[PDB]
Amino acid sequence: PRVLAERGEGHRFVELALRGGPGWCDLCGREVLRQALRCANCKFTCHSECRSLIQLDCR
Ligand SMILES: [Zn+2]
Ligand SMILES: [Zn+2]
């Protein structure tokens, strides 16, 4: 059923399906070979790996 990512008090990071071509970690400005996760609550669509650099939850 629906991915209840909302369960977390912290960043949801909802993954965006790569449209048959690249996507961009808006955070990095660099292309996301892997499915970028987007915390729709406040931040950006970042590399899965880049999520590590986020030590502060939803604004
Ligand atoms: Zn990144
Ligand atoms: Zn957030």
Side-chain angles (χ1 to χ4, degrees):
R2 63 178 291 179
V3 59
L4 184 62
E6 294 86 352
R7 65 182 67 184
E9 61 182 359
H11 298 303
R12 63 186 296 168
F13 291 115
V14 286
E15 61 182 1
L16 60 62
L18 292 184
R19 62 175 293 179
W24 294 85
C25 177
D26 69 78
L27 158 63
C28 286
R30 297 176 291 181
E31 62 179 357
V32 291
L33 297 184
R34 181 178 181 179
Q35 290 176 253
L37 300 102
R38 206 295 179 187
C39 172
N41 296 359
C42 51
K43 296 181 179 298
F44 36 64
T45 186
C46 59
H47 297 83
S48 304
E49 293 77 10
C50 290
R51 293 175 63 184
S52 304
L53 302 184
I54 294 63
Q55 60 66 245
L56 67 185
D57 283 321
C58 299
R59 296 175 63 261

PDB file of all heavy atoms in Angstrom, residues 8 20-21 29 37 46:
ATOM      1  N   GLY A   8       8.022   8.671  10.361  1.00  0.00           N
ATOM      2  CA  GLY A   8       9.179   9.258  11.012  1.00  0.00           C
ATOM      3  C   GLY A   8       9.027  10.724  11.337  1.00  0.00           C
ATOM      4  O   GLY A   8       8.606  11.505  10.497  1.00  0.00           O
ATOM      5  N   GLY A  20      14.317   7.332 -16.556  1.00  0.00           N
ATOM      6  CA  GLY A  20      14.977   6.746 -17.717  1.00  0.00           C
ATOM      7  C   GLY A  20      16.198   7.551 -18.118  1.00  0.00           C
ATOM      8  O   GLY A  20      16.831   7.305 -19.135  1.00  0.00           O
ATOM      9  N   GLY A  21      16.519   8.531 -17.290  1.00  0.00           N
ATOM     10  CA  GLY A  21      17.662   9.391 -17.513  1.00  0.00           C
ATOM     11  C   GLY A  21      18.099   9.845 -16.141  1.00  0.00           C
ATOM     12  O   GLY A  21      17.502   9.392 -15.159  1.00  0.00           O
ATOM     13  N   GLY A  29      24.336  19.447  -6.639  1.00  0.00           N
ATOM     14  CA  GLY A  29      24.398  20.057  -7.953  1.00  0.00           C
ATOM     15  C   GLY A  29      24.891  18.994  -8.927  1.00  0.00           C
ATOM     16  O   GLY A  29      24.980  19.216 -10.126  1.00  0.00           O
ATOM     17  N   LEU A  37      16.602  10.706  -2.863  1.00  0.00           N
ATOM     18  CA  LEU A  37      15.510  10.734  -1.901  1.00  0.00           C
ATOM     19  C   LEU A  37      15.189  12.166  -1.534  1.00  0.00           C
ATOM     20  O   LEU A  37      16.081  12.955  -1.246  1.00  0.00           O
ATOM     21  CB  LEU A  37      15.831   9.891  -0.702  1.00  0.00           C
ATOM     22  CG  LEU A  37      16.072   8.421  -1.054  1.00  0.00           C
ATOM     23  CD1 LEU A  37      17.515   8.049  -1.084  1.00  0.00           C
ATOM     24  CD2 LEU A  37      15.369   7.569  -0.049  1.00  0.00           C
ATOM     25  N   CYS A  46      18.187  14.431  -2.525  1.00  0.00           N
ATOM     26  CA  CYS A  46      19.622  14.192  -2.483  1.00  0.00           C
ATOM     27  C   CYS A  46      20.055  12.761  -2.752  1.00  0.00           C
ATOM     28  O   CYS A  46      19.261  11.827  -2.599  1.00  0.00           O
ATOM     29  CB  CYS A  46      20.099  14.544  -1.073  1.00  0.00           C
ATOM     30  SG  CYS A  46      19.302  13.572   0.218  1.00  0.00           S
TER      31      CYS A  46
END
